[PDB]
Swiss-Prot record:
It comes from the Eukaryota. Disulfide bonds: none annotated. It is found in: Cytoplasm; Nucleus. This is SWI/SNF and RSC complexes subunit ssr4. Component of the chromatin structure remodeling complex (RSC), which is involved in transcription regulation and nucleosome positioning. Controls particularly membrane and organelle development genes. Part of the SWI/SNF complex, an ATP-dependent chromatin remodeling complex, required for the positive and negative regulation of gene expression of a large number of genes. It changes chromatin structure by altering DNA-histone contacts within a nucleosome, leading eventually to a change in nucleosome position, thus facilitating or repressing binding of gene-specific transcription factors. It comes from Schizosaccharomyces pombe (strain 972 / ATCC 24843). Component of the RSC complex composed of at least arp9, arp42, rsc1, rsc4, rsc7, rsc9, rsc58, sfh1, snf21, ssr1, ssr2, ssr3 and ssr4. The complex interacts with histone and histone variant components of centromeric chromatin. Component of the SWI/SNF global transcription activator complex composed of at least arp9, arp42, snf5, snf22, snf30, sbf59, sol1, ssr1, ssr2, ssr3, ssr4 and tfg3. The gene is ssr4. Belongs to the SSR4 family. The lineage of its organism: Eukaryota, Fungi, Dikarya, Ascomycota, Taphrinomycotina.
Amino acid sequence: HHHGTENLYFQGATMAAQSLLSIPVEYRSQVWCRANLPYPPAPQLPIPAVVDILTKASQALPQISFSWTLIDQPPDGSLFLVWQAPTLPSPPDGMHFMSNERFFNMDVAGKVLEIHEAKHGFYPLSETRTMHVRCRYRLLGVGFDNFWLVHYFQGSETDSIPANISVAKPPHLRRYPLPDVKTSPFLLQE
Ligand SMILES: [Cl-]
């Protein structure tokens, strides 16, 4: 592949680039850059709570480390802070969806909150119906544009529909078992 868009995001991010180059080439497309916290698990969050969590993360960023790691079939409640370019695809998480991720925008205190909501989530190895929701959030205009809250939680009984990997997104099952890929921590601000 060529790396023009990636390279745009690793300008001036040397530590994160160095950590990625330590990973075998085949797995570099598979890893998430996730914060070493961990966030307590939570049910579906109100919008003001999301805004606060991302504001606090932006203010704490020089004291928070990240690692490149695989994420696979996280339990309901799982909350991650992740670094991702809005123009690159998300790495795999082991979740498939029977519908398209929908994109909503909310004005909050003169800022934009992006909500990317993927209902009808399922784990094809263990589920014949949809049981999960994934939300990716980010808050624009506060100097934290490339940082996301990613939330996995329980779907409603009313939203559960028959699931089949043959018509789901993504269409391809990931290779199991997963290799051991977790880098030692690095910083994204100094
Ligand atoms: Cl749809």
